[PDB]
Design an enzyme around this catalytic site. Structure first.
Site, mmCIF file in Angstrom:
data_model
loop_
_atom_site.group_PDB
_atom_site.id
_atom_site.type_symbol
_atom_site.label_atom_id
_atom_site.label_comp_id
_atom_site.label_asym_id
_atom_site.label_seq_id
_atom_site.Cartn_x
_atom_site.Cartn_y
_atom_site.Cartn_z
ATOM 1 N N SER A 152 22.809 68.288 -10.669
ATOM 2 C CA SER A 152 23.045 67.978 -8.762
ATOM 3 C C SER A 152 21.992 67.133 -7.851
ATOM 4 C CB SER A 152 22.698 69.547 -8.035
ATOM 5 O OG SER A 152 24.113 70.399 -8.045
ATOM 6 N N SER A 184 25.897 71.480 -2.395
ATOM 7 C CA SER A 184 25.290 71.672 -3.359
ATOM 8 C C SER A 184 27.599 71.614 -4.393
ATOM 9 C CB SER A 184 24.847 72.300 -5.028
ATOM 10 O OG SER A 184 24.835 71.221 -5.390
ATOM 11 N N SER A 191 20.500 72.811 -11.302
ATOM 12 C CA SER A 191 20.806 73.698 -12.443
ATOM 13 C C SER A 191 22.235 72.564 -13.785
ATOM 14 C CB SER A 191 20.786 74.880 -12.149
ATOM 15 O OG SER A 191 22.066 75.406 -12.228
ATOM 16 N N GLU A 209 31.214 64.954 -12.161
ATOM 17 C CA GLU A 209 31.397 66.806 -12.098
ATOM 18 C C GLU A 209 32.801 67.138 -13.065
ATOM 19 O OE1 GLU A 209 27.686 67.251 -10.021
ATOM 20 O OE2 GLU A 209 28.676 68.109 -11.544
ATOM 21 N N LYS A 216 22.774 64.101 -7.223
ATOM 22 C CA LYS A 216 23.590 64.165 -5.926
ATOM 23 C C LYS A 216 23.129 63.487 -5.384
ATOM 24 C CE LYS A 216 26.000 67.919 -7.189
ATOM 25 N NZ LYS A 216 26.780 69.376 -6.703
#
Ligand SMILES: *C(=O)N1C[C@H](NOS(=O)(=O)O)CC[C@H]1C(N)=O
Ligand SMILES: [K+]
Ligand SMILES: [K+]
Ligand code: NA
Length: 263
Positions: A45, A105, A212, A141, A48
């Site tokens: 993440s 997130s 993670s 994702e 991002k």
């Protein structure tokens, strides 16, 4: 050479069983402290930040871009979408998607940022435009989090990410209002209290983005405004040998504490 700080980071890494990457930039003197600073790690993440920044850059020439509605459909939901799922069959603006991606997130929000940029390669293209020759985004994702050891997809190095984060948040990679917006978003992160900032004095202000993934990958990238000194940029990346390993945010906190004690 190997410094006292680097030796302590190596001892922390040895006890952890995994692989730790650290990059600090102290903007008081531009000095750097690195541990495995040129090794690759899965961003998860933390990628991002680059995607949101790339959209902020687009917004510099389109004053209304961040208010543009983006449709959220049931098929757009992935594996973690606490904000986007409230807007299925509705819309979110690019500002709302950026805020959700960074501060909560949300993975559906990240996919909308990636799509706005033309796919993962559009995020990489922005990285190149701001001088980061290392970052690569290859997938959307949730597959960008597979974090397989030795796989270059969706990776960067601590050194490159620290340099980029500095340029985005403290430098001039973005326009002034866009930089301020990115800083505001990072400072309002909800997910960071157990990671870098847990290792730092509580009087210091932190903006960060965690991540993670598989292989127990546990990451944090942060801008830090310490008491009485110029800002720091700190990246802590951590990954482990087995696919199902548990997250280790405490290792990132420990790395940050060693870094702070070495200032
Ligand atoms: C980012 O790495 N992810 C999105 C989500 N939030 O975790 S975060 O707050 O550490 O960014 C779930 C984990 C992870 C993912 N697998 O996409
Ligand atoms: K997480
Ligand atoms: K220093
Ligand atoms: Na995990």
């Amino acid at each position: 050479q190997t410094s006292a700080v680097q030796q302590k980071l190596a001892a922390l890494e040895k006890s952890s069983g995994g692989r730790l990457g650290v990059a600090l930039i102290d903007t008081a003197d531009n000095t750097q402290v690195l541990y495995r600073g040129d090794e690759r790690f899965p961003m998860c993440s933390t990628s991002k930040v680059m995607a949101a920044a790339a959209v902020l850059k687009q917004s510099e020439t389109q004053k209304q871009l961040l208010n543009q509605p983006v449709e959220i459909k049931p098929a757009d939901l992935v594996n973690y979408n606490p904000i986007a799922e409230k807007h299925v069959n509705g819309t979110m603006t690019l500002a709302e998607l950026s805020a959700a991606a960074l501060q909560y997130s949300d993975n559906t929000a990240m996919n909308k940022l990636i799509a706005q940029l033309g796919g993962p390669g559009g995020v990489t293209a922005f990285a190149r435009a701001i001088g980061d020759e290392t970052f690569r985004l290859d997938r959307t994702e949730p597959t960008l989090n597979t974090a397989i050891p030795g796989d270059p997809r969706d990776t960067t190095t601590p050194r490159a990410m620290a340099q980029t984060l500095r340029q985005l948040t403290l430098g001039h990679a973005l326009g002034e209002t866009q930089r301020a917006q990115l800083v505001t978003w990072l400072k309002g992160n909800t997910t960071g209290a157990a990671s870098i900032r847990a290792g730092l004095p509580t009087s210091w202000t932190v903006g960060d983005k965690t991540g993670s993934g598989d292989y127990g990958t546990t990451n944090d990238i942060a801008v830090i405004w310490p008491q009485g000194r110029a800002p720091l940029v700190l990246v802590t990346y951590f990954t482990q040998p087995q696919q199902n390993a548990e997250s280790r945010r405490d290792v990132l906190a420990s790395a940050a504490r060693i870094i702070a004690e070495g200032l």
